[PDB]
Structures are given as C-alpha cells and as structure tokens.
Design a protein around this nucleic acid. Structure first.
Ligand SMILES: O=c1ccn([C@H]2C[C@H](O)[C@@H](COP(=O)(O)NP(=O)(O)OP(=O)(O)O)O2)c(=O)[nH]1
Ligand SMILES: [Cl-]
Ligand SMILES: [Cl-]
Ligand SMILES: [Cl-]
Ligand SMILES: [Cl-]
Ligand SMILES: [Mg+2]
Ligand SMILES: [Mg+2]
Ligand code: NA
Ligand code: NA
Length: 331
DNA sequence: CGGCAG
DNA sequence: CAGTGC
DNA sequence: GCCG
DNA sequence: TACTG
C-alpha cells in the first residue's frame, strides 16, 4: 500500500521537501501533456506526487530509485537538479509548447486540435477567432476563455449548489443534491461546481433533467450549454455555464449528474475525486479482479457480480483500503 | 513487452 | 469510430 | 515517464 | 465513462 496513492492521505503533500525539484518536473510534464505524449505525462504526474509526499529531501541516486514511481531516468534528473540547481532539458522544450497550451485551454480543443491549428500557422486566440474552424463547444469555450480558467471562492460554489438544489427540490422535495469535486474535498477555490442528484426512493430521480433545466433557464441562471443530450430521455449529465444574479458576477462552469440511489456511493466516490485518486483506486480494483466504475464495484467478467456498496466506506473496505475523508483524496 | 481508469 | 472532458 |  | 459528429 506504500505504492498506491489511494492507500495514503494526500496531506502527505503539504510538506513537500522537494519543491525545487517538483517545480521543474511540472514544467516538463505540462510540455509533454499539451504535445499529446499522455503516457509520459502520466509517469511524470506520478513521480511528482511521489516526490511531494516523500518524507525528506531526496539527496542521492539510490534513494531516488527506491521511491515507487521514480525510476532510473527520473532519478538522473533529480541528481542533475541537486548538483547543478538547473535541469538542462528545460532549455530544450519545443518552442510550440506555449501556443499549444494557449490553444488546448479552449474547452473542447485538446492536443490533436491544438497541434492541427499550430500546423496551420495559427499562433494567437485572434488567429483562432478569425480563421479556425470551431465546433459549437469550442466556440463557447473561446467566448468564455478567461472565465473557464478562473477558479471561484468555495463560498460562491455553495451559492451555485444551493441555486440548483432549490430548483430541484421545488418540483420534488425528496431529491438529494450534493456538491462534489474539489468543493467536497474542502478546497478554498473551485474550477467548477459538480452537483450530484439522486432520490432515496430509488426511482423518482428519473426524467428530472428536463424539468430542472427548464427551471434554471426560466431564472436566467444558465448562460451556455456545453454537453446536454435532451432528446432521448436517457440524460445522465449536464455540462454548462451559469451566472449568479446581480453585479460583480462571473460566468462559472457547472456540471450536474443524476444517478439512481442504488449507485449513490460509487457515483459520489467518482464525482468527489480527485481524478488521480480515482485512477489509483480503479487500478487497484483491477489488480484484485474487480472493476470500479461510477455505477458499481463489480467482479471481473466472463458478466461479473455487482458487490454491495451502500456507502463509500464499503468500497474502501472491499478493496482493503483504509477510509479517507474527501479532503484526504486530493491527489 | 504492454498497460497506464472507466 | 476519434477526440474530448468528467 | 513508471510499473509488473 | 458519456458525449459529439
Ligand atoms: O479525468 C477525470 C476528471 C474528473 N474525474 C472525476 C473526479 C473529479 O474530482 C470529478 C470532477 O471533475 P472536475 O473536472 O470538476 N475536477 P475537480 O472538481 O476535482 O477540480 P476543479 O473542478 O476545481 O478543477 O470527476 C475523473 O474521475 N477523471
Ligand atoms: Cl414534492
Ligand atoms: Cl497509483
Ligand atoms: Cl470471482
Ligand atoms: Cl456514502
Ligand atoms: Mg470540479
Ligand atoms: Mg466538473
Ligand atoms: Na522506484
Ligand atoms: Na481544451
């Protein structure tokens, strides 16, 4: 369990004894990510968490290699920074990376789109606005480019959650609404608000998006939709943009999912995160012949068995993990 | 050598 | 499906 | 990038 | 893992 971040409190990272190392590695990791080398970036992300949580300053090649998530190549970089204070590869990152970062921060444009735009000769958001072909989503992303990069005070996330909850409970008073993501992990600021909705009777959650969305639109609260499949009635999620009433308010990202009560624990676990916490826990489940989704914990296929998970604590227990409160899942 | 969450 | 984001 |  | 196109 030394080797599984989901087995450890994320508060281990609050005493990073290797900042001069991890601040340099983070630059490389972001360069690989925006260029599309996702697996190399993932290795970097895991090495950075390992270094942030290590109990002391790493001082030797041998000590570094012993750390899970750190191998020979990462160790060599560590000892280059220890000895010289610098990491030479930082001076040799593709010059396209700033522009690729600029472009892939458009919601709906990832690395493939950003690289295409870069190859077409675009270098600024002015170039994108006037010359790029944009999807409906990307055009909304561009319109809200600064908004979507800003994080809101958690107090504002509460007001957003309460807006959604009151609209939902107006037409069914038994609905349960919970803000998840970084809000539930206790962060001071939130990139968006992640609202989970269910009904304890097991069945009244069905067909509420149409009524909820109409209610939120009648108020003027929703200002743009990113993902909202409203035509076939099987809608699990809404992704969009809202703005609280009155002066001094910014457009804020809002994600909503509705789930049947029988799946509450796994959905709450998924939506609280963090993302790397989830991937660790899911990877841990797989090694044990299980599978963890936002819907259920189940055994491996042939159709597997669905394991009983009435609360989040049961998922931890079934994977042999000590329980972590949301604030300790912030990997 | 291949996965790396689902 | 590939690409994208949660 | 790292891991088994 | 659920959307788009
Ligand atoms: O790749 C992902 C992204 C998110 N998730 C889950 C965990 C995450 O906390 C939750 C909400 O996604 P967000 O993008 O909103 N991330 P988070 O709320 O943790 O941080 P913030 O919204 O403040 O950036 O969905 C994943 O499982 N995998
Ligand atoms: Cl009612
Ligand atoms: Cl892990
Ligand atoms: Cl079995
Ligand atoms: Cl629970
Ligand atoms: Mg969030
Ligand atoms: Mg979100
Ligand atoms: Na190691
Ligand atoms: Na993007």
């Amino acid at each position: 369990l030394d080797k599984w971040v989901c087995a450890q409190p994320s508060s281990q990272k609050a005493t990073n004894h290797n900042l001069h190392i991890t601040e340099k590695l983070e630059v490389l990791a972001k360069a690989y990510s925006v260029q599309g080398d996702k697996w190399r970036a993932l290795g970097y992300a895991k090495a950075i968490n390992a270094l942030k949580s290590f109990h002391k300053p790493v001082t030797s090649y041998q000590e570094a290699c012993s750390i899970p998530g750190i191998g020979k190549r990462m160790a060599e970089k560590i000892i280059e920074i220890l000895e010289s204070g610098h990491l030479r590869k930082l001076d040799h990152i593709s010059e396209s990376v700033p522009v690729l970062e600029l472009f892939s921060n458009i919601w709906g444009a990832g690395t493939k789109t950003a690289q295409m735009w870069y190859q077409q000769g675009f270098r600024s958001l002015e170039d994108i606005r006037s010359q790029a072909s944009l999807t409906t989503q990307q055009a909304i992303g561009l319109k809200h480019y600064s908004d979507f990069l800003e994080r809101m005070p958690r107090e504002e996330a509460t007001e957003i959650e309460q807006t959604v909850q009151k609209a939902a409970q107006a037409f069914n008073s038994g609905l349960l609404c919970v803000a998840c993501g970084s809000y539930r992990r206790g962060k001071a600021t939130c990139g968006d608000v992640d609202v989970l909705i269910t009904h304890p009777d097991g069945r009244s959650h069905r067909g509420i998006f149409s009524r909820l969305l109409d209610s939120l639109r009648q108020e003027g609260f929703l200002t743009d939709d990113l993902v909202s499949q409203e035509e076939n009635g099987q809608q699990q999620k809404y992704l969009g943009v809202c703005r609280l009433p009155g002066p001094g308010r910014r457009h804020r990202r809002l994600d909503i999912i509705v789930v049947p009560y029988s799946e509450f624990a796994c959905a709450l676990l998924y939506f609280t995160g963090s993302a790397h916490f989830n991937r660790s826990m899911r990877a841990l489940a797989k090694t044990k012949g299980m599978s963890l989704s936002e819907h259920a914990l189940s055994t491996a296929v042939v159709p597997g068995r669905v394991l009983p998970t009435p609360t989040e604590k049961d998922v931890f227990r079934l994977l042999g993990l000590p329980y972590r409160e949301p604030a300790e899942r912030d990997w």
